[PDB]
Design an enzyme around this catalytic site. Structure first.
Site, PDB file in Angstrom:
ATOM      1  N   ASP A  87     -85.962 -12.894   5.536  1.00  0.00           N
ATOM      2  CA  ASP A  87     -86.018 -12.664   4.100  1.00  0.00           C
ATOM      3  C   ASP A  87     -84.720 -13.135   3.454  1.00  0.00           C
ATOM      4  OD1 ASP A  87     -84.190 -10.042   3.527  1.00  0.00           O
ATOM      5  OD2 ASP A  87     -85.203  -9.850   5.468  1.00  0.00           O
ATOM      6  N   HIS A 131     -81.637 -18.087   2.290  1.00  0.00           N
ATOM      7  CA  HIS A 131     -80.660 -18.856   1.534  1.00  0.00           C
ATOM      8  C   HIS A 131     -79.384 -18.069   1.253  1.00  0.00           C
ATOM      9  CE1 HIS A 131     -83.997 -17.255  -1.012  1.00  0.00           C
ATOM     10  NE2 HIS A 131     -82.989 -16.653  -1.618  1.00  0.00           N
ATOM     11  N   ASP A 148     -94.428  -8.982  -1.459  1.00  0.00           N
ATOM     12  CA  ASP A 148     -93.513  -8.753  -2.566  1.00  0.00           C
ATOM     13  C   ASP A 148     -94.070  -9.141  -3.927  1.00  0.00           C
ATOM     14  OD1 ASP A 148     -91.127  -9.096  -0.264  1.00  0.00           O
ATOM     15  OD2 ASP A 148     -90.567  -7.829  -1.967  1.00  0.00           O
TER      16      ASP A 148
END
Ligand SMILES: OC[C@H]1O[C@H](O[C@H]2[C@H](O)[C@@H](O)[C@@H](O[C@H]3[C@H](O)[C@@H](O)[C@@H](O[C@H]4[C@H](O)[C@@H](O)[C@@H](O[C@H]5[C@H](O)[C@@H](O)[C@@H](O)O[C@@H]5CO)O[C@@H]4CO)O[C@@H]3CO)O[C@@H]2CO)[C@H](O)[C@@H](O)[C@@H]1O
Ligand SMILES: OC[C@H]1O[C@H](O[C@H]2[C@H](O)[C@@H](O)[C@@H](O[C@H]3[C@H](O)[C@@H](O)[C@@H](O)O[C@@H]3CO)O[C@@H]2CO)[C@H](O)[C@@H](O)[C@@H]1O
Ligand SMILES: OC[C@H]1O[C@H](O[C@H]2[C@H](O)[C@@H](O)[C@@H](O)O[C@@H]2CO)[C@H](O)[C@@H](O)[C@@H]1O
Length: 1526
Positions: free
Chosen positions: A533, A536, A668
Site C-alpha cells: 500500500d 510510492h 478503499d
C-alpha cells in the site's frame, strides 16, 4: 531448449528499443519451466548482450552485472561480476547472462575514456517474472483473479474463514489477497499493526497454524495467497516501540520536527480548556469558528514566543557581543560591503559568522551567530570601541538578517491557520463529512500529529504518525528535513499508525531493519507474494532491500503495489529496481463513461491488425548461424521462446509497459451503489475482466454490499449468503479467461478494439494467432439517464456466436443487520433477442440489440475471424530458406533491388515501381524498397500510413510483389523464391482486409532476411561475420551487379554488368564506366569474394584496348569512348588487386581475350570482320599499356565531332599522353580536355562555359603516376617470380628503357615534382614557384598543368598515390600532408574536391543552374568543392597507414611481438565513419551517396547510391582484416 533473448546495445552501452510500446521496463515473459524441471536444473533465461564492434565502449570494456554466476550463489544487489568484451573492428561481441532465479537484475559497462580515464554508464535493469503454479498447473500472470478479503470480517474462527474460501472458489478466483493477518493495534485498523512478528491471537497462534491454512487453500480450492506488507508505519501502541523509540522520527532522530511537536501538544492543551477560556465548542456558524480561530491565535500562536526557531535572538546577541568584545578581533577582507548597502551587508554576516546549520530548523534557538567572527567584522567596519555605535549597528544588521526569516514566518503561520480552519469546518460543519460531536479527548479540535509515550529508557518521546500531503510529491519523505508539512499542518494524518524512520541503511535504525527483515521473511515463507500500500511513499532503498530478502526466501515472490508516482517514468523506475510484477489500477476512479472506456483502452491490448516485429536491414546476418530450416525445432513441452522466423536471431528484449492488476473495486474506494448505482456492478466487472491483464475485486462487490466498509470501526461479519449478485457471472468470466490463458503469450499476441457510444461501451478482445475473439456489449449504469438505442454493430470478415447475456436489477434496499454484513437483493435475468445477421457474400456479421436491454446489462459473443486458423503462423514462418536455396549473388539483385529504370529495361518500359497512393514509389522495385519504408512503420505501428491504408484497401501491392518476378523468373533461384511469395501472398489475400498490412510486412520481411542471409553466406568470411555496417556496404555489391537487356560488358552477350550508380547510371551507355568499375572492383567484388565476376569485368574491358588506353564510357564493347587517361591505370591496378587476393590469381595473366578493334588503333569496326580477328593475353595487355605510354601516343578521338560530345571543342578531341623521361612521370591532356575523374564539361550558354572544362587536369596527374609506380612495382616482382616476362620499354625516338630503371626514375623524381615543402628554404629542392602556392605541406594535385595554379591546388587525389604506391613518400612528409587533408579537405561523409581557401571554391552542385556564373552554371562546380564519398575511402586507407608508421601512439605490440594498431588509432578510425554508418542507416537507398554538398548537405542531383562510394570503404575494412585479424 531455447530460452534466449537478444538485447542489442548502442555505442554508449544503452539498450536498443526494437519497438515503440511506450514508457516501459525490460520485462522477460512469464513462462513455465520445461517439463519436470525445478529452479536450478537449467537457466530460466539467457540474455544475449550485443555490443557494437569498434564502439567507444569496447575500448578496455567490461560488462558488469549483479546476476549470480550459478544457482548456488545467492543474489547480492551490489556484488557485480566481471565479463570481458572481446574488442574487434569487424565483429560484434555477444555476452550471455544466464539467469537462474526470478528477481531484479541490472548491468552497467565500464570502459577506457578518450581521456584514458575510467568511465561508467547508467545501471540498466531488467525483471524476470516469478513462476506461479498452484499444484502442478502453471498460472499465466495475465490470468490471475485476485479476491481481496479483510481478516476481521471473515469470522472469529479459522473454519469461519474457510466458508468464505469456498465462496470465492466457486466464483473461480485463483488468488486471495489478505489484509495483514497480524495482531492489530489500538484502533483495530488492519494496517496499524501492533506486533509484526506474530499473527492475530484471535485466530492464529503460530506460523504453522497460518501456514497450514494457506497450504490448505492451495490444495483444496486451487488458490494462491498473498498479504499486504506495511513498511511506512506501525501501530501507535507497540511494546517494542517502548524499547526502541528511535525506530521513528523523534526529537533526537529528526530534530527539525521539534517546532511541530510543541505546536501539536499546545493545540491539544487548548482543546482541554476550549469552553473554559472561550466558549465555541460545537456550533455550525462560520462566525463561531472565527471566534475559536481568534482564540487559537491568542492562546497558542501568541504564547509560542514569536517563534525564535527562525529569527536570531537580537538582544541576546548584543548581550553576548559585549561579553567577548576583546577576543578574536580584526578582519582584513576589503569586500565587506558598505554600511549603506544594508541588504548586501546583512547577508555577508550570514555567510561568515554563523554556527553550523544556519537557516534550517532544529531547537528553539538553533540559528545563532558566531560572536568572535561578528565582533571582528564590527571592529573592522566601524570601531574597535564598543560604545561607538555598535549596539545600533549590530542590532540594525541583525534586524535586516531576520527580515527574510520574519517573512518566512508570516507565510508559514498563514498556511497553518488556513489549513486548520478549512479542516475544522469540513470535519465539523457537515459539508460532506459529518460527526460534529462536541470536542472530546477522543475527538479533539486538532487531529493528533504525534504519538506520546514514556519509553523504557526513562525519557519521554514524541513519534508522529504518517499520512499524505494533499497534492504533494509522494517521492518526498514529508517526515524528513526536506519537508515542512508537519509544521505548516499540511498533513492528513492516521492516528492509528506511527512513523517508521528508515535511514540511508541499517546504520541509522538498527533494530527497525532487523525487525522488518524478520517480519518480511516470515510472510515470505508462507504466502506466494506481497501487496504494498502506497509504495510510492516507501523509499526506494528501503523497498529494494526487503523485497530482495523476501525473494531469497520465496524465489517466486509475486509483488503488487498501489503505485502512483509523479509520472509513468517514475512508475517504470520503481518497477525496474524493486521488481514489481503488477501495478494496481482501479476501475472506480472513472468519473464518467468516457473515462472508463479510456481506462479499459489502456489495459486492453494493442490495436487489431497490429504490425509484427521482424529483423530487417538493421540486423547482422552471420553466415555461420543456426537455422530452423522449416520452423520445426520447437517442442511445446520445452516452453521455449520462439524466434521470429527460420533464421535463429533470438527474440528481442524490448521495454514493455509494466503489467497491470485491474481491480473493478478495491477495499478503499466507494461501492458502485455509492458512486454510481448497483446495476453498474455487472457491466463494470465485465469490461475489466475482458482486459488482457490480471483482474481482481474486493469481497462485497460481487455480493453488492451497500456502502464501503469502514476498515477502522466496523465489526460485522461477511454474510454466508451464497451466489448473490454477480457471483454467477464472475464464475463465467474467470472460467473463460482460463481457456484463453493456455495460448496467449506475448504483447503482440493479444489485440483489442474499444468503442464508447453514450452509455454503452464495446470491447472486442482478439487473439492475433488463431483469430478467436470475444465481443462484449455492456450498457453502463452510472446514472439512470433514460433510454438509449445503440446502432447496428458490424464486424468484417467475422462470424459471431451468442455466448451469454445478463441483466442486473435491484429489488429494493438492503437489510439492516447489526451482526452480519448483507448485500442488496438483486435479480440476475438472462437476456435474449440478439439477432446475429451474417452476409454470406461480404462475409460481414451484423448484430442488433433487443429493446429489452436495460442499463446494467451485458452480452458476450464468441467470434472468429475468417481465414485464420492455428496453422497460419507456421506456414508464413517456414519454407523461405529452402526457397532461397538456389539464389546467387546476381539473382538476389532482382529480388531485393532494381531501380525503376533498371526495371523498365526488362519490362520494355511497361512495369516499374509500384505507386503508393498519397505517398510515392518505393526506392527499389524489390523487397529492399518495401523494407526501407516498413521499418519505421513496424516500429511505430503506424496503421494510418498511406502504405498501410493501401494494403487493406486492396490486394494490388500484394500481387505486385509476386508478379514482378515474372521478368526474372528464368534466373537462378528466382522461380522458387516467387513460388514461396506466391503461396504466402495467396493465403494472405484470404484474410480480413484490416489484417493484410501486418501480414504483408511479415512475409516481405521474412523473405528479405532470408535473401540477405543467403548473400552473406555466398560472400566471404570477413563480410559474412561482421557488423551491420559492413554487411550493409557489402549488399551494395548486389545492387550494382546485374544482367540487363539494353547494355552489358560484352558486345555479343548480355551478362552481369556493374552499374556506376543507381538510378542515373544503370541503363544503356550510362551504366558501365571503366574508371568507375575498376575503382570499385576490389571493394565490391574482391573483398566480398566475387572472384569469377571480377575476372569477367577485367576480361571484358581487355577487349576494348586502344591507344594503349582503357575507355571510360564502355558502350558494352561497341564504339567505346577513349577520353580516359585515368581508366587504364585504375584497370591495371585492379589486375594487381586480383592477382594479390584471388588464390591462383596469376592464372588471369594468361587468359586470352579476343581483342576487338585492331592493334594499330585503326577505326571502329563493329561489323568489319577485323573486330574479333586476333586474341591478346592479360600479361600482354599490361605490357601494351606500359610500352605504349613510353613509346608515346597520338590520336584524335574516333568518330570525332559533335555527334560524340556536342560541347567539346574541335581541339578538345585531340588529347594526348607523353612520358617525360627525365622524371618518369606520365603527362597528358590540355585545357580543352577532361581525361581524369574530374571530367565536368561545360554546358552553359548564358555563362558561356560550353566546351570549357571545369577541371581539366592536363599534365602529370598524381593518381596516374601513383598507379604507374604501382604497376611497375607489380611487374618487376612478377618477372622475378616468373609469371611476367617483358622487361624492355621503347621510346618515342627508338631507344630502350628497362622497367626497373623506369621504376627507379619515379622513385627518385616523384616526390620532388609534387611535394610542396613546408620549409620555404627548400623551394630550391622540390621544383616550386612560390608565387603560385596556397598552402605548403601539400603533395601537388598536378604537375605541369596548363594553368599552373591548379598544380598547387589542395585536392583529394594525392591519396590514391599514397595508397597504391606508398614507397613514393617519405613517412614524415606524407603524414603531415594527410593530416592537413583531415582538417581541411575532409567532410562528414564526402571528401571536399577543392580547398575551401580557394577563390574557385563553389561547393553546391546544381546541374540545372541557368545563371551567369562562369564556374557554377550547369554544374561546372562538380569537382570544385562538392564532397565525394569514394575519395574518403582512399583518404582514410592512407590516413590509417601513415599514422601507423608515424605516430607511435597509433602502435601497439603483443602477438608474436608484431605491430598491430593501437586502440587509439582504431578510435580515430571509428569516429571518421559514424556519418557513413548513419547515412546508410537512414537512407531509403541502402547505400552511400555519390556526392554531397558543403558540410553534409544533401545534394539532390547526386546519385543516392554509388558503386565506388561504398566499395572504397570496403577497401579499408579489408586492409585492417587481411593484415591484423589473424
Ligand atoms: O549514342 C550514345 C551517346 O553518344 C553521345 O555521348 C556523349 C554525350 O552526349 C556527351 O555529353 C559526353 O558525355 C559526357 C558528359 O558531357 C560529361 O559532362 C560527363 O558526364 C557527367 C555530367 O557532366 C555531370 O553533370 C553529371 O551528370 C549526371 C548528374 O550529375 C546526375 O545527377 C544525373 O542527372 O545524371 C547526369 C548524367 O546523365 O555526371 C555525368 C557523369 O560524370 O562525361 C560524359 C562522358 O564523357 O560525351 C559522350 C560521348 O559518347 C551522345 O551525345 C549521347 O546523346 C548518346 O546517347
Ligand atoms: O497493379 C497494382 C497497381 O497498384 C497501383 O494502382 C492501384 C491503386 O494503388 C489503387 O489504390 C487503385 O486506384 C483506384 C483509383 O480510382 C485510381 O488510382 C484508378 O486509376 O485505379 C483504381 C480505380 O478504382 O487501383 C489501382 C489499380 O487499378 C499502382 O499505381 C499501379 O502502378 C499498380 O499497377
Ligand atoms: O597566398 C595564397 C593564395 O591562394 C589563393 O589564390 C589562388 C587563386 O584563388 C587562384 O585563382 C589562382 O590565382 O591561384 C592562387 C594560388 O594561390 C587564395 O585565393 C589567395 O587569397 C591566397 O593569397
Amino acid at each position: 531448449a531455447h530460452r534466449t533473448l537478444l538485447l542489442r546495445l548502442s555505442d554508449s552501452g544503452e539498450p536498443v528499443t526494437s519497438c515503440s510500446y511506450g514508457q516501459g521496463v525490460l520485462t522477460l515473459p512469464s513462462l513455465p519451466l520445461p517439463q519436470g524441471k525445478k529452479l536450478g536444473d537449467m537457466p530460466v533465461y539467457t540474455v544475449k548482450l550485443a555490443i557494437p564492434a569498434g564502439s567507444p565502449v569496447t575500448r578496455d570494456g567490461l560488462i558488469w552485472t549483479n546476476c549470480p554466476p550459478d544457482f548456488s550463489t545467492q543474489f547480492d544487489r551490489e556484488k557485480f561480476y566481471k565479463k570481458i568484451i572481446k574488442t574487434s573492428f569487424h565483429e560484434d561481441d555477444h555476452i550471455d547472462l544466464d539467469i537462474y532465479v526470478p528477481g531484479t537484475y541490472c548491468f552497467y559497462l565500464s570502459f577506457k575514456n578518450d581521456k584514458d580515464e575510467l568511465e561508467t554508464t547508467r545501471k540498466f535493469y531488467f525483471v524476470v517474472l516469478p513462476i506461479l503454479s498452484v499444484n502442478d498447473k502453471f498460472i499465466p500472470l495475465n490470468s490471475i483473479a485476485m479476491q481481496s478479503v479483510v481478516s476481521k470480517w471473515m469470522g472469529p474462527t479459522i473454519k469461519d474463514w474457510e466458508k468464505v474460501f469456498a465462496r470465492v472458489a466457486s466464483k473461480k478466483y485463483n488468488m486471495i489477497h489478505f489484509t495483514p493477518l497480524q495482531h492489530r493495534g489500538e484502533s483495530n485498523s488492519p494496517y496499524s499493526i501492533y506486533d509484526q512478528l506474530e499473527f492475530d491471537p484471535t485466530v492464529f497462534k503460530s506460523e504453522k497454524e497460518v501456514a497450514d491454512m494457506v497450504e490448505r487453500l492451495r490444495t483444496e480450492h486451487n488458490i494462491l495467497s498473498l498479504t499486504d506488507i506495511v513498511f511506512n508505519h506501525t501501530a501507535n501502541n507497540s511494546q517494542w516501540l517502548l524499547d526502541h523509540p528511535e525506530a521513528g522520527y523523534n526529537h533526537k532522530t529528526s530534530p527539525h520536527l521539534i517546532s511541530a511537536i510543541e505546536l501539536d501538544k499546545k493545540l491539544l492543551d487548548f482543546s482541554e480548556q476550549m469552553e473554559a477560556l472561550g466558549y465555541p465548542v460545537d456550533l455550525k456558524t462560520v462566525d463561531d469558528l472565527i471566534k475559536v480561530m481568534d482564540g487559537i491565535k491568542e492562546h497558542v500562536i501568541g504564547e509560542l514566543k514569536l517563534w525564535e526557531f527562525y529569527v536570531v535572538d537580537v538582544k541576546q546577541t548584543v548581550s553576548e557581543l559585549r561579553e567577548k568584545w576583546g577576543n578574536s578581533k580584526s578582519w582584513s577582507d576589503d569586500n565587506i560591503p558598505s554600511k549603506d548597502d544594508s541588504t548586501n551587508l546583512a547577508q555577508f554576516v550570514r555567510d561568515n559568522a554563523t554556527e553550523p546549520g544556519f537557516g534550517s530548523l532544529g531547537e528553539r534557538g538553533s540559528n545563532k551567530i558566531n560572536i568572535d567572527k561578528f565582533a571582528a567584522i564590527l571592529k573592522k567596519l566601524h570601531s574597535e570601541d564598543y560604545n561607538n555605535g555598535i549596539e545600533e549597528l549590530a542590532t540594525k544588521i541583525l534586524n535586516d538578517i531576520n527580515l527574510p526569516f520574519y517573512k518566512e514566518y508570516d507565510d508559514d503561520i498563514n498556511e497553518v491557520l488556513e489549513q486548520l480552519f478549512n479542516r475544522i469546518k469540513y470535519l465539523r460543519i457537515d459539508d460532506h463529512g459529518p460527526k460534529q460531536g462536541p470536542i472530546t479527548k477522543k475527538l479533539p479540535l486538532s487531529e493528533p500529529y504525534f504519538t506520546r509515550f514514556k519509553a523504557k529508557d526513562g525519557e519521554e518521546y514524541a513519534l508522529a504518525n504518517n499520512g499524505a500531503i494533499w497534492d504533494g510529491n509522494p517521492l518526498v519523505d514529508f517526515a524528513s528535513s526536506q519537508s515542512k508539512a508537519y509544521l505548516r499542518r499540511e498533513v492528513i494524518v492516521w492516528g492509528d499508525c506511527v512513523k517508521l524512520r528508515y535511514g540511508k541503511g541499517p546504520s541509522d535504525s538498527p533494530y527497525l531493519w532487523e525487525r522488518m527483515s524478520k517480519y518480511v521473511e516470515m510472510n515470505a515463507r508462507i504466502f506466494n507474494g506481497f501487496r504494498i500500500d502506497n509504495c510510492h511513499s516507501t523509499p526506494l532503498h528501503v523497498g529494494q532491500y526487503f523485497l530482495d530478502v523476501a525473494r531469497r526466501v520465496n524465489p517466486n515472490l509475486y509483488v503488487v503495489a498501489e503505485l502512483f508516482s509523479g509520472s509513468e517514468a517514475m512508475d517504470c523506475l520503481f518497477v525496474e529496481r524493486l521488481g514489481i510484477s503488477s501495478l494496481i489500477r482501479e476501475a472506480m476512479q472513472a468519473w464518467s463513461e468516457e473515462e472508463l472506456s479510456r481506462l479499459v483502452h489502456r489495459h486492453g491490448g494493442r490495436p487489431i491488425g497490429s504490425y509484427k516485429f521482424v529483423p530487417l536491414d538493421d540486423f547482422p546476418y552471420p553466415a555461420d548461424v543456426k537455422i530452423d530450416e522449416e520452423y520445426c525445432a520447437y517442442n511445446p513441452d520445452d516452453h521455449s521462446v520462439k524466434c521470429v522466423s527460420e533464421i535463429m536471431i533470438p527474440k528481442t528484449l524490448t521495454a514493455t509497459p509494466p503489467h497491470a492488476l485491474f481491480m473493478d473495486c478495491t477495499h478503499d474506494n466507494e461501492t458502485p451503489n455509492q458512486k454510481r448505482t448497483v446495476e453498474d456492478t455487472l457491466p463494470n466487472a465485465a469490461l475489466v475482466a475482458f482486459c488482457s491483464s490480471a483482474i481482481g475485486s474486493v469481497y462485497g462487490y460481487d455480493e453488492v454490499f451497500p456502502q464501503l466498509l469502514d476498515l477502522v470501526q466496523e465489526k460485522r461479519t461477511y454474510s454466508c449468503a451464497e451466489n448473490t449478485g454477480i457471483s454467477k457471472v464472475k464464475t463465467l468470466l474467470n472460467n473463460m479467461r482460463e481457456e484463453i490463458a493456455s495460448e496467449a503469450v506475448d504483447i503482440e499476441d493479444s489485440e483489442m478494439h474499444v468503442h464508447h457510444d453514450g452509455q454503452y461501451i464495446t470491447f472486442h478482445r482478439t487473439n492475433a494467432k488463431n483469430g478467436k475473439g470475444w465481443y462484449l456489449v455492456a450498457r453502463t449504469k452510472f446514472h439512470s439517464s433514460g433510454d438509449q438505442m445503440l446502432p447496428r454493430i458490424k464486424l468484417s470478415q467475422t462470424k459471431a456466436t451468442f455466448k451469454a447475456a445478463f441483466s442486473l436489477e435491484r429489488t429494493g434496499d438492503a437489510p439492516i443487520s447489526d451482526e452480519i454484513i448483507e448485500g442488496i437483493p438483486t435479480k440476475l435475468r438472462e437476456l435474449t433477442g440478439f439477432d446475429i445477421g451474417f452476409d454470406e457474400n461480404t462475409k460481414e456479421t451484423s448484430i442488433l440489440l433487443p429493446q429489452d436491454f436495460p442499463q446494467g446489462s451485458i452480452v458476450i459473443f464468441e467470434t472468429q475471424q475468417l481465414g485464420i486458423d492455428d496453422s497460419l503462423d507456421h506456414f508464413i514462418r517456414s519454407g523461405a530458406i529452402k526457397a532461397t536455396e538456389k539464389l546467387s549473388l546476381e539473382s538476389i539483385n532482382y529480388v531485393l533491388y532494381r531501380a525503376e529504370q533498371e526495371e523498365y529495361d526488362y519490362s520494355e518500359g511497361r512495369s516499374g515501381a509500384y505507386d503508393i497512393p498519397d505517398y510515392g514509389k518505393p526506392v527499389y522495385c524489390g523487397l529492399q524498397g518495401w523494407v526501407s519504408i516498413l521499418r519505421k512503420i513496424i516500429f511505430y505501428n503506424d496503421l494510418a500510413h498511406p502504405l498501410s491504408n493501401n494494403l487493406r484497401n486492396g490486394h494490388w501491392a500484394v500481387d505486385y510483389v509476386v508478379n514482378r518476378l515474372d521478368l526474372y523468373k528464368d534466373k537462378e533461384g528466382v522461380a522458387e523464391v516467387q513460388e514461396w511469395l506466391r503461396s504466402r501472398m495467396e493465403r494472405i489475400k484470404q484474410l480480413p482486409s484490416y489484417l493484410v498490412p501486418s501480414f504483408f510486412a511479415l512475409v516481405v520481411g521474412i523473405m528479405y532476411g532470408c535473401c540477405r542471409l543467403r548473400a552473406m553466406q555466398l560472400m566471404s568470411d570477413n563480410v559474412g561475420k561482421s557488423t551491420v555496417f559492413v554487411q550493409s556496404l557489402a549488399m551494395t555489391s548486389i545492387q550494382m551487379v546485374s544482367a540487363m537487356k539494353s547494355t552489358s560488358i560484352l558486345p555479343d552477350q548480355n551478362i552481369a554488368a556493374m552499374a556506376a550508380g543507381l538510378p542515373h547510371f544503370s541503363t544503356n551507355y550510362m551504366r558501365c564506366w571503366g574508371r568507375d568499375v575498376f575503382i570499385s572492383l576490389r571493394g565490391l567484388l574482391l573483398t566480398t569474394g566475387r572472384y569469377e565476376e571480377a575476372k569477367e569485368h577485367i576480361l571484358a574491358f581487355a577487349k576494348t584496348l586502344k591507344h594503349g588506353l582503357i575507355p571510360n564510357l564502355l558502350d558494352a564493347g561497341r564504339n567505346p569512348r577513349y577520353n580516359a587517361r585515368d581508366a587504364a591505370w585504375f584497370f591495371v591496378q585492379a589486375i594487381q588487386d586480383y592477382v594479390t587476393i584471388v588464390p591462383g590469381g596469376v592464372s588471369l595473366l594468361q587468359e586470352k581475350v579476343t581483342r576487338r578493334f585492331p592493334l594499330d588503333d585503326e577505326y571502329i569496326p563493329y561489323d568489319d570482320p577485323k573486330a574479333f580477328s586476333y586474341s591478346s593475353t592479360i600479361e600482354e595487355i599490361i605490357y601494351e599499356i606500359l610500352n605504349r605510354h613510353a613509346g608515346g601516343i597520338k590520336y584524335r578521338e574516333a568518330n570525332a565531332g559533335p555527334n560524340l560530345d556536342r560541347v567539346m571543342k574541335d581541339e578538345g578531341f585531340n588529347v594526348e599522353v607523353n612520358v617525360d623521361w627525365e622524371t618518369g612521370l606520365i603527362h597528358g591532356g590540355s585545357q580543352f580536355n577532361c581525361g581524369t575523374w574530374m571530367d565536368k564539361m561545360g554546358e552553359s550558354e548564358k555563362a558561356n562555359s560550353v566546351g570549357v572544362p571545369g577541371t581539366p587536369r592536363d599534365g602529370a596527374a598524381v593518381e596516374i603516376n601513383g598507379l604507374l609506380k604501382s604497376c611497375l612495382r607489380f611487374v618487376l616482382q612478377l618477372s622475378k617470380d616468373g609469371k611476367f616476362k617483358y622487361t624492355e620499354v621503347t621510346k618515342p625516338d627508338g631507344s630502350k628503357i628497362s622497367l626497373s630503371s623506369w621504376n627507379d626514375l619515379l622513385q627518385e623524381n616523384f616526390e620532388r615534382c609534387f611535394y610542396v615543402p613546408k620549409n620555404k628554404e627548400d623551394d630550391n629542392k622540390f621544383e616550386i614557384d612560390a608565387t603560385i602556392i596556397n598552402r605548403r605541406g601539400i603533395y601537388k594535385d598536378l604537375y605541369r598543368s596548363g594553368k599552373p595554379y591548379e598544380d598547387y591546388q589542395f585536392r583529394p587525389n594525392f591519396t590514391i598515390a599514397m595508397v597504391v604506391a606508398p614507397e613514393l613518400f617519405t613517412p614524415d612528409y606524407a603524414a603531415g600532408a594527410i593530416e592537413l587533408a583531415d582538417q581541411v579537405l575532409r567532410g562528414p561523409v564526402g571528401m571536399r574536391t577543392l580547398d575551401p581557401s580557394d577563390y574557385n571554391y563553389r561547393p553546391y552542385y546544381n546541374n540545372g543552374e541557368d545563371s551567369d556564373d562562369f564556374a557554377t552554371s550547369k554544374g561546372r562546380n562538380y569537382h570544385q568543392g562538392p564532397e565525394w564519398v569514394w575519395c574518403y575511402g582512399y583518404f582514410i586507407r592512407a590516413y590509417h597507414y601513415f599514422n601507423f608508421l608515424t605516430n607511435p601512439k597509433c602502435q601497439v605490440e603483443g602477438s608474436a611481438k608484431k605491430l598491430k594498431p593501437s586502440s587509439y588509432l582504431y578510435r580515430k578510425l571509428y569516429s571518421r565513419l559514424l556519418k557513413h554508418r548513419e547515412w546508410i542507416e537512414n537512407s531509403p537507398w541502402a547505400g552511400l551517396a555519390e556526392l554531397t554538398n558543403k558540410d553534409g548537405e544533401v545534394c539532390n542531383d547526386s546519385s543516392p547510391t554509388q558503386a565506388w562510394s561504398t566499395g572504397c570503404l570496403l577497401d579499408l575494412f579489408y586492409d585492417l582484416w587481411i593484415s591484423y585479424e589473424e
